[PDB]
Each structure stands twice: as C-alpha cells, then as structure tokens.
Amino acid sequence: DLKSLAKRIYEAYLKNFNMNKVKARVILSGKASNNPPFVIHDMETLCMAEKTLVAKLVANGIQNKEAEVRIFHCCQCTSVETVTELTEFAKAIPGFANLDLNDQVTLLKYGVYEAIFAMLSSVMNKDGMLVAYGNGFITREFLKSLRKPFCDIMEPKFDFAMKFNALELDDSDISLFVAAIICCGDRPGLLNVGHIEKMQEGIVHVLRLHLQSNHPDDIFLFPKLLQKMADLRQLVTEHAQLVQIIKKTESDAALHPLLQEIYRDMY
Amino acid sequence: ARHKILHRLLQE
Ligand SMILES: Cc1nc(-c2ccc(C(F)(F)F)cc2)sc1C(=O)NCc1ccc(OC(C)(C)C(=O)O)cc1
C-alpha cells in the first residue's frame, strides 16, 4: 500500500494534468524552439495573442470590451479547466472515491484553489507565466499595469510562486503535495473527518519519506512545505475576498457556473 | 441544486 503510494499518485498526476513543471520548464528554457510561446507584454501584443490563440475575442464586438474583462474571462476559462483536471486527479487518489459524495464535493470546494495556486508556480518565473496551454506568456509587469481591481489579482500569486519555486520541487514532489492539499481533514462541513484524516496521514507519511530521498540536502523541506500549505490557505481566503468584490462591482465579470459554485459560501 | 456541476463531474 504505502511502499508505492507515491508512485501511483504521481501517475494520476501525469495522466490528468496537461501542463506540469517539466513541460513548462522546457518551454521557458529559451532553447531552440520551432514554436516559442507568444509574449503578451502590452495591449498591442494582447490583441495579437487573442487573434491567434482565442480568435473569438477579437471579433463580435468583444474586442471593444475592456482588456481587463477579456483577460479575466481567459483566467476563468483556465481555472475551469484546471478545476476539471483536479477533480479527475482527486478521483484517482486511493480512497477519495469511497468518501461520501458531499465530502468529495467539500474537499474539492476548499482545496482546488490551494492546489491551483501551488501549481501556478510550475508555469511561472519572476517575469510572468505561461498561458493558453503553453502557447503564450503574459508578463508580470503587464498584469500590474491593468486597472484595479484586476491588477491586484496576480501579484500575491507571483510572490508565492517565487518562494515556492525556491524549494526546487519536481513533479513527483508536487503530485504528493497536491494530494495532501485535497485530502484535508479540517475543511468546514466534513462528515467523515476520521476517514479523511486517515487518508491524509498516509499521504503525508509517503510525502515525508519521498522528500528525504529526493531532497537529501534540505532537512527542513518537509516543515517548509507544511508552512506553504498554511500560506496557501491564507492566499485563497484573500483571493476569495477579492473575487467577491469583483463580482459586486464589475458588470462584465460574472463568474462561470462552476466557479460560482465553488466560491458560494466558501469563506 | 448546490454544487450541481461538481456533483456531476464526480459521478462520471
Ligand atoms: C493571468 C492569467 N492570464 C491568462 C491568459 C490566458 C490566455 C490569454 C490569451 F489572450 F488567450 F492569450 C491571455 C491571458 S490565464 C491567467 C490565469 O489563469 N492566472 C491565474 C488566475 C487568475 C485569476 C483567478 O481568479 C478567478 C476568479 C478566475 C478564479 O478564482 O478562478 C484565478 C487564477
């Protein structure tokens, strides 16, 4: 069971996420490439990127909507796809599918954004992040140049990602970290807390062992990761607050049904 | 219903 639990979770991760750290790092390496990612660094390049990567946003009057609204829409589409992948990944985590459906819903509801921000680190560097399935790269400075409140969304995530990337984790490490995030026994409204705590204990057990053999020169890596879990929960609570503000003040930023479900009565 | 989409995704 535990001897190869890490390998299985890792397989589920490689099978369910179209983008991971090894793939992202190759694209960001700057090495010779036949299809380098299109850089979005200003309004001009944003329109060019939309024309090729999401053509629908350059026609039908949509090109007349604020850049911020178009970017926010793309952010939503991206989150919906990631939530969809995380749901399939969760179903592949040993024991998750055995939980009562309500508990499965609750774990994903509170855990998906912690996992999303942790995984964002994989496609980010200090200057920006990969988007559109690795075909685009939007700069950190461009996002900062947007008008509030849209320019206030990404900075905290970039800051988190820089400190997270400093841990030099690889996909095998990340797959276990994400599983631990999802199988969290203290989420509000859980029914079988005991059952979930048992799953988490096993995952944390294999994670601790994995870090010991995969990262021998950093004896504090495990506690560092525990702190990251706490940092992520805070990052999500603050993000939800901003999302609620955008919902109440932005006329063309209505949330996609799935995202609305997730944030409804979250924090 | 509450969480209609998540419930659906989980049951497939
Ligand atoms: C910053 C960014 N740009 C994208 C991008 C992609 C493509 C294109 C292109 F034009 F097509 F190239 C431009 C920009 S996709 C993207 C992103 O997903 N960043 C992370 C993020 C941003 C906002 C979030 O809040 C919402 C409310 C959506 C949520 O909580 O789900 C969450 C996460």
Method: X-ray
Structure tokens, A260? 């609305």
DSSP symbol at A228: H
CA distance A34 to A267: 45
Structure tokens, A231? 């940092």
Cβ atoms within 10 Å, residue A54:
17
Name the CA dihedral angle for A209, A215, A216, A217, rounded to a multiple of 10 degrees. Answer: -140
Which residues does a chain break follow in chain B (C to N more than 2.5 Å)?
none
CA distance A44 to A109: 37
> Are the C-beta atoms of A83 and A53 separated by less than 8 Å?
no
CA distance A105 to A99: 10
Structure tokens, A73? 């829409």
CB-based contact B7 A101, cutoff 8 Å: yes
Resolution of the entry in angstroms? 1.8
| Distance between first and last Cα of chain B | 17
The C-alpha angle A126, A110, A14, rounded to 5 degrees, equals 60
The H-assigned helical ranges of chain A are 5-16, 21-28, 43-53, 67-91, 101-120, 140-145, 155-165, 171-182, 193-214, 221-249, 257-263
- CA of A75 relative to ligand 1 center, distance in Å: 2
> Are the C-beta atoms of A70 and A60 separated by less than 8 Å?
no
CB A115 less than 6 A from any atom of ligand 1: no
Domains located in chain A, CATH noted:
1-267 (1.10.565.10)
Least Cα distance to A88 among B1, B8, B10, B3 occurs for B10
Binding site for indeglitazar: residue ranges of A? 79, 113, 263
CA distance A5 to A237: 31
Only one residue has tokens 């969760």, namely A90
